[PDB]
Amino acid sequence: KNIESLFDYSAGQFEFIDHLLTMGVGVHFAALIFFLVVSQFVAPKYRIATALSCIVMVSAGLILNSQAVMWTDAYAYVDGSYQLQDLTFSNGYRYVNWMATIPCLLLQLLIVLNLKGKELFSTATWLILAAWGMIITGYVGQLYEVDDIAQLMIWGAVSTAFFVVMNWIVGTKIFKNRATMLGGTDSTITKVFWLMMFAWTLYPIAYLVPAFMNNADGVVLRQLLFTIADISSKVIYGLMITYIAIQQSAAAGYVPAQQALGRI
Numbered sequence: 001k002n003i004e005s006l007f008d009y010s011a012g013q014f015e016f017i018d019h020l021l022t023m024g025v026g027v028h029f030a031a032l033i034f035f036l037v038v039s040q041f042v043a044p045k046y047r048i049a050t051a052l053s054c055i056v057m058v059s060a061g062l063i064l065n066s067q068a069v070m071w072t073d074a075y076a077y078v079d080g081s082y083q084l085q086d087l088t089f090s091n092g093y094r095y096v097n098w099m100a101t102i103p104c105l106l107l108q109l110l111i112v113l114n115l116k117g118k119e120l121f122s123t124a125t126w127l128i129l130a131a132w133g134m135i136i137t138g139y140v141g142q143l144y145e146v147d148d149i150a151q152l153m154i155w156g157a158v159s160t161a162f163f164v165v166m167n168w169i170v171g172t173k174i175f176k177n178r179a180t181m182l183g184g185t186d187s188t189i190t191k192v193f194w195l196m197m198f199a200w201t202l203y204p205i206a207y208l209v210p211a212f213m214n215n216a217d218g219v220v221l222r223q224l225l226f227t228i229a230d231i232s233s234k235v236i237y238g239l240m241i242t243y244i245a246i247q248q249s250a251a252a253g254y255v256p257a258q259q260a261l262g263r264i
């Protein structure tokens with residue numbers, strides 16, 4: 001049902017996709033160790049924001065690892081090209097993983113925005129419902145990326161509606177709560193918003209690849225877009241969230257944060 005299954009791949013195409021996914025694994029688990037060690041310099045009220053980046057690194061790292069092994073399981077070099085064997089490859093499992101990872105990315109944002117108690121719970125709930133609506137409709141849509149492009153497009157339109165509404169909740173909370181933020185991170189959080197807008201928009205672009213580039217090179221392009229998007233939306237984003245958490249920790253008088261920023 002996925003366009004990947006339609007084509008044979010050159011040695012170059014196959015190996016590049018393998019390297020992309022493997023590099024993805026390496027970057028996420030390397031970042032994991034960074035977030036782990038810096039977590040001790042985060043104040044208790046923000047420390048979960050850094051913990052969530054650790055959780056996202058392993059979740060994303062495992063899905064990329066699984067995709068890479070699925071890639072090599074599914075294809076073998078036969079008569080001059082990599083050809084599909086008995087096992088299958090599908091990006092569908094990425095969608096399932098987003099059900100967990102996207103709420104984690106959203107929650108760590110709400111935490112460094114200094115949302116608390118009732119507002120935190122209600123905002124998270126609405127955000128997660130919007131995100132789940134987006135993911136589920138998108139998942140359904142990509143089931144048709146070979147059989148029914150028109151259906152892919154309509155489910156994609158519905159998903160994009162959830163996407164836009166989710167982004168509106170995010171933007172509204174960011175620009176409303178920007179003023180509460182310490183240590184100059186009122187400035188930084190604005191860049192986080194734009195980073196999110198950029199990186200997350202790469203995913204629906206990948207979703208549409210079967211509509212504008214239905215061939216083996218399109219398959220490569222989609223994996224390339226996922227790689228850019230994953231690293232931007234999880235790793236670079238996580239680094240910014242953690243930087244914001246530490247800076248606010250220091251401004252709030254958390255001594256390990258002050259000491260850590262002092263050594264650099």
Ligand SMILES: *C/C=C(C)/C=C/C=C(C)/C=C/C1=C(C)CCCC1(C)C
Binds near residue numbers: 137
């Ligand atoms: C770490 C993974 C992330 C941040 C994934 C984000 C995914 C999206 C923003 C997906 C968006 C989609 C649309 C807006 C329309 C097409 C269907 C989706 C689900 C790919």
Ligand SMILES: CCCCCCCC/C=C/CCCCCCCC(=O)O
Binds near residue numbers: 012013227228231232
């Ligand atoms: C935040 C940015 C992260 C960047 C991740 C991407 C790193 C590797 C990028 C690809 C370079 C282009 C390689 C040329 C593709 C050859 C085409 C082919 O052989 O199939």
Ligand SMILES: [Cl-]
Binds near residue numbers: 043044045046
């Ligand atoms: Cl605290």
Ligand SMILES: [Cl-]
Binds near residue numbers: 059060063097098101
């Ligand atoms: Cl993920």
